[PDB]
Nucleic acid binder design. Structure first.
Ligand SMILES: [Ca+2]
Ligand SMILES: [Ca+2]
Length: 291
DNA sequence: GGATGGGTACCATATTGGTACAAAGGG
DNA sequence: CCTTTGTACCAATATGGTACCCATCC
């Protein structure tokens, strides 16, 4: 069964803690939701997660994407137990803390709809304001004088367990095989990207794997990547590491194919014509080219 | 009446992930 | 000379997010 730190690592990568407000004829409803949305080829892994959470919530599917949503207050309590015991470490931790606060207010009040004059409602709107994309312009018109709450700082966070990294990479990792345009040479890369708001966390990856380096992703500097390329490191640190703490979902297959190329390179087979042919074949069917 | 659940449409960008080469750097 | 590595480039979409509407429950 799926390890709990894997579930957390995967949520730091792809999950969401949201509170939304809707008007319902002179009353506002507070709608909490926890959400994971993936491309449809990973429905299977969503099923394993939903399962981990006592089959709370529901999956929905639309030809290209699939979505796990947990929206009822009963169901949400068990989600919150998990993340209290196995804490997030990305900036997503802060949206989770704010989320948790609102949930507690709703439980204290035993209900989800409020008349504009409610004090609890204003406290909630104040907190909602510092979450995710903040207030809508519609709500902003109806509550002009609300001061957003303090967004908690998330600093100096350590990777709590290797299984977190397996979850996280199952979410944001990428395994590549580079061929030269001249078609002579082959190399590998393992990359993880993130928004610049988590540059600190990503720089500590160099320490975790004990190799690789850290770059900006584009001229904007609004995103950064962790990268390993050096083949000694890939073959001695990165691959053994993930043979033990296994990645999951379709990305597992890309990791298997990547591993296969890596063995051919170990044995020098990448400098043979057939070896290069086999590697090109493997490459043409991995990642976004996968059947 | 009113409240909640849940399916599904819709929005925006942080990833998703492909390419490329010059400068190491070895024997 | 020859092959690996660090770094760069960047288009677009798989993600992270939000809204609306109604059937059914109290
Ligand atoms: Ca993410
Ligand atoms: Ca992903």
């Amino acid at each position: 069964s799926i390890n709990p730190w894997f579930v957390t690592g995967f949520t730091d990568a792809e999950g969401s803690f949201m509170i939304h407000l809707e008007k319902n004829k002179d009353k506002w409803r507070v709608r909490p939701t926890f959400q994971i949305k993936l491309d449809i080829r990973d429905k299977s892994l969503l099923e394993e997660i939903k399962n981990y959470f006592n089959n709370t919530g529901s999956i929905n599917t639309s030809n290209k994407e699939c979505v796990y949503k947990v929206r009822s207050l009963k169901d949400i309590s068990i989600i919150i137990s998990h993340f209290d015991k196995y804490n997030l470490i990305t900036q997503k931790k802060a949206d989770f803390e704010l989320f948790k606060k609102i949930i507690n207010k709703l439980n204290s009040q035993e209900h989800l709809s409020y008349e504009v004059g409610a004090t609890v409602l204003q406290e909630i709107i104040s907190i909602r304001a510092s979450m995710n994309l903040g207030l809508s312009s519609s709500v902003k018109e109806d509550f002009p004088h609300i001061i957003p709450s303090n967004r908690p700082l998330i600093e100096n966070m350590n990777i709590p367990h290797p299984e977190w990294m397996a979850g996280f990479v199952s979410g944001e990792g990428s395994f590549s095989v580079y061929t030269t345009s001249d078609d002579k040479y082959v190399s590998l890369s393992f990359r993880v990207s993130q928004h610049n708001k988590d540059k600190q966390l990503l720089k500590s990856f160099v320490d975790f794997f004990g190799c690789g380096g850290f770059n900006y992703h584009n001229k904007g500097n609004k995103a950064v990547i962790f990268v390993t390329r050096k083949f000694e490191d890939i073959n001695d640190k990165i691959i053994p590491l993930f043979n033990e703490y296994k990645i999951k979902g379709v990305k597992y297959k890309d990791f298997k194919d990547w591993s296969k190329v890596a063995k051919m390179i170990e044995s020098k087979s990448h400098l043979t014509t057939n070896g290069y042919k086999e590697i090109c074949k493997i490459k043409e069917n991995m990642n976004s080219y996968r059947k």
